[PDB]
Structure formats: C-alpha cells, structure tokens
Design a protein around this nucleic acid. Structure first.
Ligand SMILES: [Co+2]
Ligand SMILES: [Co+2]
Ligand SMILES: [Co+2]
Ligand SMILES: [Co+2]
Ligand SMILES: [Co+2]
Length: 155
DNA sequence: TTTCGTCTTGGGTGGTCCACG
DNA sequence: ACGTGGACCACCCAAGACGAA
C-alpha cells in the first residue's frame, strides 16, 4: 500500500501502477542469480521461487495488485491470478465447466478447487476439522462448520 | 530460455437451510 | 412445536508440478 518494503529500498509512492512497476523492474527484473522476495514480513522469508515469474505473482500479495480485470461491462472485479479471473468470469454466465468427477456424483463447480472440496468432503466419511477442546471430541468436514463451533460452543 | 496452462492441493471466510433432537 | 447445528457451497487466493507453448 504505496511504498516499497523491499529490504533496504525506501521508495514511497503515488499509484499502485508505479510501485508495481518499480518492483518488476527494480527488484525482480534483471539478474541471473536466483529470484527471492525480500519484503518485510514475508511468510517464506527467503523461500526462493523456482522461476522468477513466480515471484512476480507473489508480490501481488505484498502489492495488492489484481490486474486481471473482468470484462462483462459494468462489473469491475479484478483478481491477480489468471485462473481466478477465469472463474469469476463464468459466474457472469453460469458456466459450471467442472463436474464432480468421481465415484458417481454428477454435481459441478465453476472451478476446479471447489470441486475438489465437495469432492473429497462431501464423500468424506471422516471429519478432520476436529475441534481441539478437551471433553468435546466434536469434528466437522469443513473449516467453516468447525470455526462456527469453536466459538459458538467453546471460545 | 521462460513463461504459460491447467491441475492439484491447501490455507481461509460468509453463508444458506432444514432436519432432528 | 421448533431452533439451531452443521453439512455443503460460494467466493477468496496462494502455490506446487510438469508439460506446452
Ligand atoms: Co524497492
Ligand atoms: Co514475499
Ligand atoms: Co465480473
Ligand atoms: Co460429488
Ligand atoms: Co469444540
């Protein structure tokens, strides 16, 4: 939010455009000696990336930049991951390209991942969002059901 | 080369919604 | 006679891998 925080760099700024410009040119762009974020609190410190285009997407965490805009006139939602914008898209249509494929369900998602939750969870059997308050033994399929409990109940 | 493509896997929030205790 | 608990979903989004452009 308007100011590099790359280790040592001190450019404050005016527009996302510029900052998210400076990074790719200043820090991520050039060099032939390995790409790693060096941003303040980076949850990976220096867990280098494989390719360097991968770092580049990562910053969008740090930067805030969701550059894949939606097209459907009127709507103005970006994302910062292509995959995402793709799905955000279908919703404008109803496109559920992604059927629960396996064992014999026939239900489908606008996207792959939600198809994989449902997919594993809804045909679960186990419930691994077990609450961890002693004298409960309360477990659910999804973090949401859990979460609601450990706080409607405990907490 | 590197980057994409698209999938897999995985860490979240807000909620409907209704059935059964 | 019935309230809520919790299964299931919608959106959120990071990142591997591995091959294709
Ligand atoms: Co900088
Ligand atoms: Co970082
Ligand atoms: Co849109
Ligand atoms: Co299914
Ligand atoms: Co509990």
């Amino acid at each position: 939010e308007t100011d590099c925080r790359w280790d040592g760099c001190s450019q404050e700024f005016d527009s996302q455009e510029q900052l998210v410009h400076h990074i790719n040119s200043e820090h991520i762009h050039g060099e032939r000696k390995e790409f790693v974020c060096h941003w303040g609190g980076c949850s990976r410190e220096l867990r280098p990336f494989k390719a360097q285009y991968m770092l580049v997407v990562h910053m969008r965490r740090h930067t805030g930049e969701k550059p894949h805009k939606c097209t459907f006139e009127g709507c103005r939602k970006s994302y910062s991951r292509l995959e995402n914008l793709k799905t955000h898209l279908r919703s404008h249509t109803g496109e559920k390209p992604y059927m629960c494929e396996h064992e014999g369900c026939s239900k489908a998602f606008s996207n792959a991942s939600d198809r994989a939750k449902h997919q594993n969870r809804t045909h679960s059997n186990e419930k691994p969002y077990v609450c961890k308050l002693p004298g409960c033994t309360k477990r659910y399929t999804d973090p949401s059901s859990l979460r609601k409990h450990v706080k409607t109940v405990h907490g």
